[PDB]
């Protein structure tokens, strides 16, 4: 019979009616389960032995993807279902969440032979990437409300993922000084999210799906790993101080994470070459986050 | 639930072979599933035991019917001890991994039909699966 | 008026209720004697309660379930509350044509089916006549023929005429919503109505 | 009437107490002397009370058992119960043949199995008369031979006539409910109703 | 009458007493002047309070302890409390040599040995008069020669006739079972028995 | 001097006044210690540092042993001592708990020298077994109340267990239709006891030990992995949904679980090759749980 | 047959052996532990050993049944002491390492049947499995 | 428990006569726990041995010399002499058990209870059965 293998699969994401097939996929994870409410009626008349278990529910679905950096930067997409505002190609963090519900889509993970699992009601959760020595992924995070098995799907033929970017060294910035000794530039960005389990008594004898959600709150965080490193004798520059509002950007060759004022919190480790981590957070009166996504020659 | 019409028969050698069937019908729109049993009106069982599924394949034995208790819609399937022993004749010297007294014997399925009770032969089939003859000592 | 339920509107499905409290209220003066033997007295009417909970309200679901229980406390209707546990279908038929003889005003029931209706009442089901928007629960039933013998748990709260015809399906209590003096819900900063409860009252 | 219990109904295993609470309820006249010395007087009459809490019931166990609890609210009968804590057929026999004679009151009592009861009755069990429905604890126990010479923690409420039967199986205890006026029942969206529980008081 | 405790019953080893709590009961009249100076009046009587707490009961405990429990309630006797912290066997000998000077009324006793007691009892401990009830502890001991001069927080309850005998060991308390009106024990679904205490009150 | 090592050990299950030498161990796991009350008294006149601590019970052992399967079905009577009712060579599980307490039995772990262990007051607590594509072995695990040092013991030469059961595949059915993709069939049974502590004023100045016990539950439960096959598009045999009551049965041809109607919860894995996995009990009115033990020729 | 319900026979050397059944249909939905013991008034069990499974064995031993109670439900299989002698010296020598005792001696099988005037043939497999003997010193 | 039931093991100690006491009883079970009676063991003869392997050809090292000592309550006794002690350790493996050095093997045994009665229910059953093993000892 038909076996069904992670490497021979093709994952389509469904928006606004049309296929978003995301290749230049690393790795993908996903679960299927059920929710069940089982009682033991242990009584004194008959201290039984066999429990009393029905499935009521699906248990919601946490799907993640690994997606590499395109040429046609199809990736974006997902900062854009996720909340953030778009002009051109660069993307702001909204001051205020802009509605209460997230933005709903569907997704299909197709494989050979018709076979196919359609995963309904998801949102994007998180995004967090780490610009490094090593080839940038952004992994991607979404929740799913009802699973299901389809027999015919939507495939993306068009819409699809180009050539992977060439990898190109991280840089961070203050205005326009460089920040020395960068290790590891990881940032993440979030949209926390709440199902609103509605399970009534109109749905007993049923299997229960969730259906809406309620952002709880947006984010943007980026946490920066530097060498403890100084050039003067009590220098002011390169300190362990916190700073309350500093403009920041950490750049890429076609990539920048932009915040116009940050709030630093510094921590330094004894290792065998000592090390600073940075926390990176917009403050209270900070303009939009941006992230801009240069394809080719900015 | 589901199907689970594939049930495999185990008859014994030398002795005679009855196999009593209660028909049912279950309900599970209300949580305590309907008991109600079919009632057995212009109903007619018929099954063959033929050794593998290929065409041309020879008849080794025949079932034979038994209709009783229409009301309740219990029915009987049997084949005498005569059947038995020509049946335990051509079953494969071959024995079961499980059980070191079975041997495969052949194939076979029940066959329901309604004739003509609304002009409508309305036969399926009730079960199936394989037959396995368990050799005896006492003679 | 009927209170808004998934059945009629599924669209909102936080209506729907998380859990109801079907309360007997039946007030009665119980005095226990010395010599072990306790007494009852009834005088006071038999009013089913309902309480109904619900969930995280989103602002539609919030907005259309207030604007029905304003349009309620405008016109001083009354909700008409739905137990879907209690709608299973056991007598199906026409209701017109069985007779209910009169003069019955005890706690039971004599009514001649004329054949006309098929299946069973069960007991422990919910039971209603045609001219009384009280709700009965039948405690037992007898079938001798055509002529049945229900047995209702709450004295009958009318003499019965003769035209009253008996009603299985589709049972409406008639209540009138309680606690609606001091009556709110709190909206928090992410959108989401929060702390609303419907204690309702059977006001036959 | 018979409360309804896995023994009586099996198909409703969800009937059966969770957990039962035998109360003793012997109400009396304590005076606490500046002397140090307690005095008690007995006066009013003791009643076993029975606090019966259930499991998770589906919607058909609850719908059996409130429908026979709004019989014994309709009827206005007792309601017997049967504890299977005490069920141990400690005693086999037919209890027919067994003469009680007459003219005694307080705890002792004496009966002559007269050769027919096998096995027995040892301290804890419970024991009733055959007339009178009150329910009794066999605190000690002695037999010369056929002879019993029982001892019962409350004394025996009428003097024997006779003819009164012992009753070493099946005892049920003629109660009546306490939570009668306020009876609700919760459905949760799991789709049973919990937390049910009864405060029952043997009557006379 | 005894109550079961691991002494004499160590073959139901939940019987045991998890935690005593003995009670200092001396009720006093209380009253603060304005000028600082706190007053006290005492009129009635000292009596010890025993709270006894037990564990989870098996049904052959529980039976044992509730026939002994209900034996008690029967003959209307008096629970006797022994606890294990107070059995340090200091004094031993013959006590009914000993010799009580009579007319001592107060809270002292002084008592002439007459050399056939060996060993001293220690403050704190139990002591106990032969013809009353009542249990003392001892706040002070002096002696010089063969006579004793033993303190006790009680005031004497009676005056000493000489006839009386001390016991330091082998002490009982005399005790009346409170909460015994309303006395009950749920039996789980596992088969033990909850929810058992004993509030226990000298009652001489 | 001497010591004491494991492989050179035998251990002894002392019950109903009969030695069970339980052969064939491939593994046990043991541990003895003591309960203390310590507590330090600080106070405004000594601000003391030496606590007080006294010695006043055993904490209860738990005993685990890893037994092979042997042709003589000793190890059969961990199922019977654990409470299973006995008809022939099958093993029922009881609609409802026969007793109160469990049964209670002894236990030696001889050593050379006249050196023993003795572990009194157990019972069969755990007894889990995985069917696979390894030798099949089924780890007990039994809870002591007292343990103590012994000169001599009891020691089982005749009852013993014989040769090891070869290896044999196994296979899981429902009815007789056959399931396909079978990757690892575990079962587990347990008695859920709980100690009751009565430890009591009484007990002052002395070691405590647990002696009584009450069983809370007794259950049969089975995970069952599969790899995620389908034969047709839209198949009914084989899917994701929930199945109320199916007869199953993890087949051997040595042993055979039997679940008479079960109820059968499947969780899909998106892994390298996708599995599917199942979690059977039975049902609320299914009929006893069977287990059959086949020394040879079945 | 009870292709599932296969129980091994142990036979004590120098001891006649006797094994006696309880034919007591149940029904258990009315109340727990309802149970009638199954008259076996015109019934007549019966059973043989061979020394292998399969035709042309050499017959071991037949079982000197009986009923013991008619209409009581106990019925009795068994066989003298030199049967149990002859099944000793007919059994295998290949003694297990750790069951020194049990030596395998054949498969066993018996059938019950109803010979009743106004009936047919009633004939059911009941017993299935091998008998062991174990070795005996005291003689 | 085919055979799990009936089989417990004896170890003589040697330059010791060696008696194991017997007390039979009906005990019931099925029908209610804690039910327990004797079984009048009158014309219940015993009868026992010992060989010193399984094979058709073994030596009677010894025999137990079975007495029943009251008729009723279900008590009998096995016992055997010194001088059969004494035989029994002569006619011994000289292979030490490694767990317990004083304890070597002898052979095997079984006791065999012979109800010859009047009435014709002259069964035979197999009630012991094990291994015997001997003690060694030094006060001689």
């Known amino acids: 019979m038909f076996y069904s293998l992670m490497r021979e699969s093709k994952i389509v994401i469904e928006y606004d009616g049309r296929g978003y097939h995301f290749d230049a996929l690393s790795n993908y994870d996903a679960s299927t389960s059920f929710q069940e409410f089982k009682t033991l009626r242990r009584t004194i008349h008959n201290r039984t032995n066999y429990a009393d278990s029905i499935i009521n529910a699906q248990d919601p679905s946490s799907i993640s993807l690994a997606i590499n950096f395109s040429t046609t930067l199809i990736e974006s997409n997902f900062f854009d279902w996720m909340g953030f505002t778009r002009e051109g190609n660069s993307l702001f963090l909204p001051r205020n969440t802009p509605n209460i519900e997230p933005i709903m889509f569907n997704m299909y993970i197709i494989n050979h032979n018709n076979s196919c699992i359609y995963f309904e009601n998801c949102y994007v959760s998180t995004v967090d990437f780490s610009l490094d020595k090593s080839i940038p992924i952004l992994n991607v995070g979404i929740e799913s409300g009802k699973f299901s098995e389809v027999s015919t799907f939507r495939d993306g033929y068009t819409i699809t993922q180009g050539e992977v970017l060439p990898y190109s060294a991280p840089a961070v910035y203050t205005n326009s000084s460089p920040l020395p000794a960068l290790i590891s530039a990881s940032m993440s960005f979030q949209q926390q999210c709440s199902w609103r389990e509605d399970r009534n008594i109109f749905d007993i004898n049923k299997i229960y799906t969730n259906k809406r959600a309620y952002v709880n709150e947006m984010n943007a965080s980026a946490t920066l790993a530097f060498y403890y490193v100084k050039r003067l004798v009590g220098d002011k520059f390169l300190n362990l101080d916190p700073e309350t509002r500093t403009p920041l950007i950490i750049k890429n060759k076609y990539v920048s994470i932009t915040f116009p004022l940050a709030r630093i919190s510094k921590r330094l480790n004894f290792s065998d070459l000592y090390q600073v981590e940075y926390d990176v957070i917009p403050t209270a009166d900070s303009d939009p986050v941006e992230i801009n996504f240069f394809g080719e020659r900015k | ?139 | 008026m009927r209170l808004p339920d998934p059945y009629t509107n599924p669209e909102y499905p936080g209506l729907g209720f998380e859990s109801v409290n079907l309360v007997d209220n039946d007030p009665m003066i119980r005095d226990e004697l010395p010599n072990g033997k306790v007494k009852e007295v009834k005088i006071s009417a038999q009013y089913w309660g309902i309480n109904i909970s619900y969930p995280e309200l989103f602002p539609d679901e919030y907005a259309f379930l207030d604007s029905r229980l304003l349009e309620y406390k405008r016109t001083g209707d009354y909700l008409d509350v739905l137990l879907p546990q209690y709608e299973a279908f056991r007598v199906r038929g026409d209701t017109k044509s069985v007779t209910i003889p009169a003069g019955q005003k005890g706690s039971q029931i004599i009514l001649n089916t004329n054949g006309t209706l098929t299946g069973q009442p069960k007991a422990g089901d919910l039971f209603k006549l045609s001219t009384h928007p009280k709700v009965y629960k039948i405690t037992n039933f007898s079938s001798s023929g055509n002529v049945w013998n229900i047995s209702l748990y709450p004295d009958l709260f009318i003499t019965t005429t003769g035209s009253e015809k008996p009603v299985f399906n589709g049972i409406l209590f008639r209540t009138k919503l309680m606690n609606g003096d001091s009556f709110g819900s709190t909206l928090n900063n992410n959108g989401t109505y929060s702390g609303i409860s419907l204690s309702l009252r059977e006001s036959l």
Chains 1, 6 share one sequence.
Do not use: H, W
């Open chain 2, 1 to 139: 639930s589901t199907e689970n019409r594939v049930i495999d028969l185990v008859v014994d050698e030398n002795v005679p072979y009855g196999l009593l069937m209660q028909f049912m019908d279950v309900d599970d729109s209300v949580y305590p599933s309907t008991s109600k049993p079919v009632d057995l009106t212009d109903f007619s069982l018929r099954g063959s035991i033929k050794s593998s599924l290929e065409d041309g394949a020879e008849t080794v034995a025949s079932f034979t019917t038994a209709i009783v208790d229409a009301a309740q819609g219990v029915a009987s399937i049997s084949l005498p001890v005569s059947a038995v022993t020509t049946i335990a004749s051509k079953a494969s010297k071959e024995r079961d991994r499980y059980n070191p007294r079975q041997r495969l014997a052949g194939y076979y399925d029940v066959i329901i039909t309604r004739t003509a009770v609304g002009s409508a032969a309305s036969s399926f089939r009730i079960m199936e699966g394989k037959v396995y003859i368990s050799d005896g000592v006492t003679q």
